[PDB]
Amino acid sequence: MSTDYWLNFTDGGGIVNAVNGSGGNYSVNWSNTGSFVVGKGWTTGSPFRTINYNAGVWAPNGWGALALVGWTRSPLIAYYVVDSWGTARWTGTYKGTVKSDGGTYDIYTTTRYNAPSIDGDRTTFTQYWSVRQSKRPTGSNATITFSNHVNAWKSHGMNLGSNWAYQVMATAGYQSSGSSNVTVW
Numbered sequence: 001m002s003t004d005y006w007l008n009f010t011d012g013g014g015i016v017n018a019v020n021g022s023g024g025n026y027s028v029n030w031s032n033t034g035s036f037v038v039g040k041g042w043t044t045g046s047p048f049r050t051i052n053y054n055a056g057v058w059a060p061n062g063w064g065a066l067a068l069v070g071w072t073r074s075p076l077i078a079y080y081v082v083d084s085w086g087t088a089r090w091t092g093t094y095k096g097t098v099k100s101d102g103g104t105y106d107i108y109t110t111t112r113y114n115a116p117s118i119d120g121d122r123t124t125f126t127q128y129w130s131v132r133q134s135k136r137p138t139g140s141n142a143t144i145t146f147s148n149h150v151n152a153w154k155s156h157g158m159n160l161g162s163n164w165a166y167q168v169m170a171t172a173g174y175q176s177s178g179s180s181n182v183t184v185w
């Protein structure tokens with residue numbers, strides 16, 4: 001199932017020059033950013049999708065991350081499977097680990113309020129995280145078997161909503177700079 005969605009969002013801070021490439025490819029060059037997310041993916045996420053990507057350029061600085069990102073509604077939940085990043089001190093509620101796709105991931109949950117979401121500029125939502133314990137090598141084909149994460153989260157009481165919104169292999173950042181180029185299928 002080929003990608004059919006182009007995510008390109010920023011809060012307006014700094015520069016986020018995002019390029020909608022051929023098929024599932026995209027490029028990002030960013031500097032002195034506020035909050036942003038960019039990437040190719042799917043209009044409707046699925047808990048059964050296996051996501052393939054190749055991040056041919058990955059050079060983040062600060063809290064810039066290479067991650068599967070997506071949302072559900074009912075309830076409103078943002079989720080993250082983080083494979084690499086620049087500098088990022090992960091902290092919060094911690095639920096265990098999951099092994100997937102040759103790596104081990106730390107599981108976190110966080111809450112946001114008065115915060116931007118796909119529902120508006122000042123909303124409340126929960127965030128589910130799988131954060132790889134070591135940064136994943138980039139430049140070769142990589143898989144994220146997302147059902148492994150959904151199921152691990154489920155086993156710790158982190159259930160996703162029933163209405164699936166976008167699901168993107170993204171470059172996401174906050175107060176960050178860098179360069180990335182990723183193909184997604």
Ligand SMILES: CCC(=O)N(c1ccccc1)C1CCN(CCc2ccccc2)CC1
Pocket residue numbers: 089090091092108110127129
């Ligand atoms: C598991 C995810 C995660 O770890 N986080 C997170 C939470 C929500 C949304 C995005 C990322 C961090 C939580 C803690 N903050 C510390 C920031 C800070 C440091 C020093 C003084 C004042 C503030 C940074 C983000």
Ligand SMILES: CCC(=O)N(c1ccccc1)C1CCN(CCc2ccccc2)CC1
Pocket residue numbers: 009035036037063064065067080116117118172173174
């Ligand atoms: C402290 C880290 C941080 O703040 N972030 C982050 C999270 C994970 C990995 C790297 C950076 C941001 C979290 C929020 N998203 C925007 C959410 C959104 C999407 C669509 C419409 C409206 C809002 C951008 C990145």
Ligand SMILES: [Cl-]
Pocket residue numbers: 036037069172
């Ligand atoms: Cl995001």
Ligand SMILES: [K+]
Pocket residue numbers: 020021022023
């Ligand atoms: K294009």
Ligand SMILES: [K+]
Pocket residue numbers: 096097106
């Ligand atoms: K751990």
